[PDB]
């Protein structure tokens, strides 16, 4: 008796295993990620995070990719070496298992994910999607 | 103040544009699709729906590709042609579209999407994804 869960929290592709995608988060108030692998990974891989802005030419196409300034919450003991956000997948990630997280402070409108240097050879074996919650 | 919406409705790769993978719907009890186009399409694209079964070799690997039959959905004037469940995307659908649909009755452990004969070229412009409503 499954419902049409597409509408009312849809989702979109962000990292199809080959490139990024400027996913919109404007019309929705809450969002998050979901990581999914297809094979074993060689080492601890990591991904950065970028937020976009409505380009001045057309306020519908997202502008360039601006890195996001991650913020800590009464516990972060090791800051991420600067004011950036960077997700990393652990060593023992496995197929038929998914990890999921998000960033609390959204900036701009659009969101994209890019693998940091030294992990692009492994980023070909992972899937990253975004699912929203907001009506607006 | 977004939530970790990853848990509580994850999301996975349904159709990237060049192929499609089965998605597990065992632990989850409600699910649906989210259609999204990347560019202008030329003709109405029709997608065949399939379900898979646990291969007798290993209980958590999908078996072959079996096609789903469709429910008449009583309050309708259903004009099927062979009764095999499928869903198509209407013409003039922009990449700014919230196109979402679902199968009313699930019949297996894995769901998969494939493009039907005729909807081959423009099928590499469609971007399909699936969300869950899981439990258990």
């Amino acid at each position: 008796m499954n419902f049409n869960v597409g509408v009312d929290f849809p989702s979109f592709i962000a990292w199809d295993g080959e490139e990024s995608f400027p996913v919109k988060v404007d019309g929705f108030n809450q969002f998050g990620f979901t990581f999914k692998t297809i094979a074993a990974l060689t080492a601890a891989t990591t991904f950065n995070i970028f937020y976009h802005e409505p380009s001045d030419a057309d306020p519908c196409v997202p502008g360039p990719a601006i890195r996001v300034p991650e913020v800590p919450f009464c516990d972060t003991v090791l800051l991420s070496e600067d004011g950036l956000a960077a997700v990393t997948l652990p060593e023992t990630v496995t197929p038929d298992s998914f990890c999921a997280g998000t960033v609390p402070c959204m900036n701009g409108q659009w969101i994209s994910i890019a693998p940091a240097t030294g992990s692009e050879t492994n980023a070909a074996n992972v899937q990253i999607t975004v699912t929203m919650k907001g009506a607006t | 103040m977004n939530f970790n919406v990853g848990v509580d409705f994850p999301s996975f790769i349904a159709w990237d544009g060049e192929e499609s993978f089965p998605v597990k719907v065992d632990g989850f009890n409600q699910f649906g699709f989210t259609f999204k186009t990347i560019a202008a399409l030329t003709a109405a694209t029709t997608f065949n729906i399939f379900y898979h079964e646990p291969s007798d070799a290993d209980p958590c690997v999908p078996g072959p590709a079996i096609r789903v039959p469709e429910v008449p959905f009583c309050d309708t004037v259903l004009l099927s042609e062979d009764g095999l469940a499928a869903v198509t995307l209407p013409e003039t659908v922009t990449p700014d579209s919230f196109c979402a649909g679902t199968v009313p009755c699930m019949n297996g452990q894995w769901i998969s999407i494939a493009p039907a004969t005729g909807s081959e070229t423009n099928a590499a412009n469609v971007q399909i994804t699936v969300t869950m409503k899981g439990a258990t």
């Binding site: 956000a85 652990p90 038929d96 298992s97 998914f98 997280g101 | 597990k24 632990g27």
Partner: peptide, 28 residues
């Protein structure tokens, strides 16, 4: 900072390989 909650999808193929002590008689 991203908090990665993660969770498996193939329930429990443990197969502990339960073993009992075999017929051990002495040390002579």
């Amino acid at each position: 900072m991203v908090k990665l909650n993660c969770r498996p999808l193939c329930q429990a193929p443990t197969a502990s390989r339960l073993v009992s002590p075999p017929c051990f008689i002495c040390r002579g």
